[PDB]
Amino acid sequence: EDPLYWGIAAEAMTGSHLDEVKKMVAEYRKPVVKLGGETLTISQVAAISARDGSGVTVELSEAARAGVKASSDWVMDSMGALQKELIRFLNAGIFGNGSDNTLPHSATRAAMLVRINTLLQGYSGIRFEILEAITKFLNQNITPCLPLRGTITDLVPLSYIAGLLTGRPNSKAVGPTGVILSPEEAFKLAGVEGGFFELQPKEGLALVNGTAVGSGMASMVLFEANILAVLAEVMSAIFAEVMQGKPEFTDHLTHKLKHHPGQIEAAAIMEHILDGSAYKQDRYALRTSPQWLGPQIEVIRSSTKMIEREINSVNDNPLIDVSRNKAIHGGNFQGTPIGVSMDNTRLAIAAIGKLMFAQFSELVNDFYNNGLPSNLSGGRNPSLDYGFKGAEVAMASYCSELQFLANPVTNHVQSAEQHNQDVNSLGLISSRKTSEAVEILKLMSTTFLVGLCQAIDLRHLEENLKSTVKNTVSSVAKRVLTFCEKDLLRVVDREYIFAYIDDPCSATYPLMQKLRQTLVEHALKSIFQKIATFEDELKALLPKEVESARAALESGNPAIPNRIEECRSYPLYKFVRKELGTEYLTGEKVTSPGEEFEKVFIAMSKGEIIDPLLESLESWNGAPLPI
Amino acid sequence: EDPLYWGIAAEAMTGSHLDEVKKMVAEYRKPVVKLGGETLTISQVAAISARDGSGVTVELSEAARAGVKASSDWVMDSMGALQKELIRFLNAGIFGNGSDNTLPHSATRAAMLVRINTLLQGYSGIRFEILEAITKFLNQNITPCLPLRGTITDLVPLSYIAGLLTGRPNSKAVGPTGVILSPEEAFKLAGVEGGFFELQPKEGLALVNGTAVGSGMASMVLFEANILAVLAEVMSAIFAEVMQGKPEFTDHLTHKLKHHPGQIEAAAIMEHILDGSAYVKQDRYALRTSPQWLGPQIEVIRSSTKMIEREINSVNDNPLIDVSRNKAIHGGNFQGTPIGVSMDNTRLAIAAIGKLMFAQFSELVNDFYNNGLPSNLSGGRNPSLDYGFKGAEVAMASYCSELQFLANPVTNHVQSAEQHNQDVNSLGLISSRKTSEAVEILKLMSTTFLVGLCQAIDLRHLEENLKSTVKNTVSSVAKRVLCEKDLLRVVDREYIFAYIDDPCSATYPLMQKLRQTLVEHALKFQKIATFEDELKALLPKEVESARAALESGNPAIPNRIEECRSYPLYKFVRKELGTEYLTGEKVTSPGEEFEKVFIAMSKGEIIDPLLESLESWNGAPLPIS
Amino acid sequence: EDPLYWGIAAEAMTGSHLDEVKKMVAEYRKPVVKLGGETLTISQVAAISARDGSGVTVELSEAARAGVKASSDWVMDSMGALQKELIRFLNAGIFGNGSDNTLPHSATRAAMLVRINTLLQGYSGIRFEILEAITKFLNQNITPCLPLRGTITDLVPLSYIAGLLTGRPNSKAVGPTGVILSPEEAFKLAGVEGGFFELQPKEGLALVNGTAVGSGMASMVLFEANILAVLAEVMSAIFAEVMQGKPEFTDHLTHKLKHHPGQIEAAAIMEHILDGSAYKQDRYALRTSPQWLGPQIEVIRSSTKMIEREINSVNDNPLIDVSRNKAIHGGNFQGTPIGVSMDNTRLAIAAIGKLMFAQFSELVNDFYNNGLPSNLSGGRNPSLDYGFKGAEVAMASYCSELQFLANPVTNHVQSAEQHNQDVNSLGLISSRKTSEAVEILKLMSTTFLVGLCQAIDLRHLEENLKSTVKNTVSSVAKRVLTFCEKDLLRVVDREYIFAYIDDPCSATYPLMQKLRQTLVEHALKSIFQKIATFEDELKALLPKEVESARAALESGNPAIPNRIEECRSYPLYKFVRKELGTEYLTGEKVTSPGEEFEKVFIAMSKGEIIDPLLESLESWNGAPLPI
């Protein structure tokens, strides 16, 4: 039914993207990664790549040993300085001093995990003992030092894993605390039984022939990319809340009629956030965000399945086919799936960043943000509070560099190795630039998320102070003006609080101006003789009441509670504010926006945003609201 | 008659690029960098950016004190909390954990230096005392911690220099040994007296409104780029030396007739190396066209240098305080377009230089194109257990591909920023960062190529010695067993490394062309087998003894490189640094040898031997014929 | 003094960039191009490349014949099917059907001119007769058909010039009117004496070995680029006029203190426009335009000198050195100066386009354009006139594609021709993408220039109608209100005309609102009883007077004449409006913005914008105003 395996690949793209992320997070946090050569996922690669003391360990399935020993025994039967030479001349990378030219140790761990899983299928002719030794290195967090560059997708970097296994004099390894270790010391601390391995024929190739380094980092990258995409879907909805945008842009009819599944899910996710919210036309960063993100999600998801197939592949050469009693020469080391997927993912990451920059730009602009103060200024004095103006420039710098990284790597192939490798995938290089793009998207996600929480608090401030103004205006009108008191309060309804609240009784601001106009309108239809009195009484009472209401709110005793507390998006806000301690940014305090950004960005790097994010949708049935 | 200052700029681009590099190096090594707001060079920025204990210090010219105090007093006489707010909201950068999101402290020192120089002209309205404090931080190697990202070209990274000066609670500084310091501790170690500064009006803008970070690092990059450009020129000649290429490709007529000065100087530099080569006794484009290829790259790098050298002596403040007319001048000198343009153009030139190195390296290691050198430049007796630079060649392609990727520009990704008030911005520092990345990758290719050239040199030394050996014993077997004039001609023509691993191998040419040779003279046969039996019994012994003698340091014919003008770089790599001839019969790997050169290169130790290769050059091409 | 020729190259970068453009335009329009092998300029290449019947002809200097015959005679003395073979196998281009794969005929003419000038030096060993034959083809406008692609910088395209000279059966040529011609017909119509040439040794190489095609189109490109740069400098100043921006951004102190000569000239040019103008803080597209354009001009100018040296070079191989009696083998065919200069110019063209898009965006936005109507709407009814809204989207599409073309071509080199050409410059390809970028910049220049003229007329309308409102308001106040009449007119001074003029007496617009406020302010200090009367009289008179004033202006009889008539920028406006007939775009007429854009864009393609542009600066002394 499925001779070319199109069908089984299609079966993996069914279900919602969120569910995959939910499952992805679930198996990431499982305590044991069992390698059988067929079931490795990017979440398991990521979980192992972490050096945060999670406790995760790697186990090799004994069901695969028989196949591994068979191909190994086959090579010995068909038959050692050639293996020593292979590792020597491939040690051609450059470390220099420092870590700027060394592969990140978490990326080395990813490569080590993938390198094992791609050798368990049993077609590589390498001793199971070597696969067990690399597992000890992972479990005891003993990482060999690999060069950052030197591969076109990974003879050179992988040879530094073989160099540690064979006890090369130049081989170095890092301990759990950053200590430089010699090969002997590395073996002693990892518990590798016996001494250094004397590589048998084909064992050298089995270790260096393969795409594990590129595919390993691509797995780490795509794990973070799948989270950040969902985080982009939810933040677009939170963005629509504080922007008070028309929620019909999520209506399922609109998206159903495009058939794009990524767009339909994205709109359904946002609809679910807005459907449980207590809060010409809207601009594109808001109204078209489902159309904009849909394809990006479809790309990250499709790219995820490419890598997952790669990390469960046999990418060495030649293939030892015991069943047929012959070695098969091929080109499964050509890591084209890595370069293509990372180039496509990097562009999608940049498209996500562009939308976030566009949304952030709307949020901090009083021309577009529907009443919020310019720069999301939070202080009583807008002239001594410029809020996120500095962050807005940073967002432009983030986005600009993201669009530069969106360019591909795979269109720069060189005819290499005496033109024998006249085509090569550049996979790892692409994974490296896509990792850089994710980290910048994390910078943008940190800044954007803290701004939304600032806007949330400002909406909470708007409602409380708009009520205080109403009460004082009504109290003063009942005193003095006795249809005229009903129209006076409609003015307070229409005017944006943050257009006058820094000085409620300034004759140049719209409150006192439009209040007077309403009185003049009625006088023409003595209401004019009382204007002077009304403005005197209001000038004496309103400033005191506004200040009182703001202090009560700042003191935690608001007259009207923050509506976010009853929003489906509350967990993310609760996480930033309550759990992390991210504080309201105001020009009356010394705390700078960056200091608040550190908290979210650090936690986001520790994966602490996964739970509050998923909790915002945990009651979603995975379907749109009926139309 | 130079009202627009075109001519002053054109006068700067006269003389050779080399002389400019020699002056640039010599100034890098001066023990004192005196700032006057007008004479700052990239070499001075590079020398101060270094945190290597060189001892270089910074002095402020007292002549600029008056102008500085004038604009400072004018502002105060024109009249606080706004200066505290300015630095607060511009502290919008993210550091996280580690140093991945932190500006390298060397780049920070560069920014601090340029920041001082761009305020000494007297048009910024900032107290001289603050400039003196930053100078203490530099000379005491007390560096504030700046974020790597957050600017569109430097209100944000520059605000963290101001954050240190004002004693912000989140402000962090690092000591010479990497120890993190508080703003109070920094002032103590730095020697700054009086405590934190309470910024006066305009002083906040004076500190943060410059282009110092972008321009500061472009100076570091351009310093490295200027040197690597000359290194690429010299190595192209050494490449043409070990390749035995026709030196006719450096004939001045060819390059005189194109007029391009970069191509003329490049052709003339390689001509000087080849004209003084002891090997003196068509080619492919990586060799025959290298001057045409490198010429334009040096012109862009040299042009880009002058752009940045003007930027680091400019006044990028705003507003400018003009006391002579008693008013502030609002403009846009903070627009760092010269940084983004020069860095985009320079990165493309770096990529073109790297592309040439890759093509040359490829020719040098391919036995089809390297004129008798062994495939992969293998140095062992058993080529089946010595693949030489095959792994390095793969790394070169990886270095080259990522460089072509970085060759793309940054300045074509401008976003309409800050509520669309900054609807154009230069992105200079971002471009400086990517060009700096391209530079470090080119250092990887130069290290690998340079060590590869020394390998090729030792392989020509092995070839000549073993060519002489085979000739001799062939004449011995010829005189004793027997013709000779043709048999001896076979040895001179044939490539050593086509048969030397097994000279008398029937499948190899030496023990085949001699048969063909003897049979030819016979046809125009009974003495063949005896001569072969005599040669088979004697040639392995004589070859192994001469090869072992060369390995012990007492070869028959000495290495001709010692009598070449290119010897300084070989002596430095092979003798001074300890780099060793790579061979599969030992366990040392190519990387281990690359490490020695890359580290030395990262510390500037390649500069001296490089310029020494051209010390005797008069700066002009030798005459025609 | 100048052994490496750095000095003589530096001497060519002295003087103002404008002067070079002035000289450039001067020699472009000279009737004869005399080739001596040393003095060819891009303006002469451009003038010859034109097929517009300018009458320009090419003359070969007899001073060069001696050198040409010497090297030719030298080859014959040192010594023919090899020349026949060289041209045959290099005829490997593909034309297909149509012109999408054919080199533009003007680009072929550029290549032909450069190909001659690079063979007149006398080091190429080719018969002077052949150089004379190609000259006939140029003078009689007989152009061989060259393929668009097939060169990495030009064996293949140049071989189709040799194919015409040797009468190849596949060779085709185009006539002055587009007629396809065979080689025989081409010779007959051009007047080439004798039959087809039988190429002697080295003559085939002399024709195909060289960079003429890339350098030829680079010359055409840089001629237009030098004009468009000056046009960008002037339009930034005109932009500042209609924007009513602070002119101190051109103050020479600011730019003198950066030392950047391109910035100093750009600011001095703008200062000169504004210094003779009768017309939070300003934004960057305005205030930093000299900083932004300076480097772009320095790049185009420096790139110009690279190409001019290339078109006067000997780029064939081997070089026949008669003086030394030996042929010199080298690599002057490596067209690196072309690729580098075109890549750098393309980026600068994109930087110019980005600033223009930024400026256009400010101009059409009522939040930023300082009183002009949104979209530069010109009709009485803003709801039926959206002005340049459609053009603003087009500008974004222009700019976006320009930033894509800003990417380089020279970082995509392939190891070619059995890896003998392991490095190559890709010059022509780069020239082709830079030509595409210029044409898009022409689209942006057309649209932006017509918008400025729209804004000019709107400023003329603003002044006339603001005066009409003043007179009616004063006439009504003198009637009814008799310090109060002086404050009423100050309101008219402060309010932007186009914020209310479409309905001057709407109670929801700011005119009637802020007029009433001023009356109420005075009444509180009976002035209140007369408000109703004042608004009745104004409602009856003001609409009639506004309409009368607008018709008088539309009828050519404005009460106040258009201040542009006395501006140094008047020529460009006079050219667009008067000479070309570009009409005021108003939603009350059927004419669309594109129709007006055709006129300017067509004329700009015919070089008709050079004179009005230069006339705006013809009285500039080439120095900044004293500080």
Ligand SMILES: COc1ccc(/C=C/C(=O)O)cc1
């Ligand atoms: C991002 O925060 C900012 C933005 C703008 C400025 C002033 C700029 C000028 O003087 O033209 C200062 C700080």
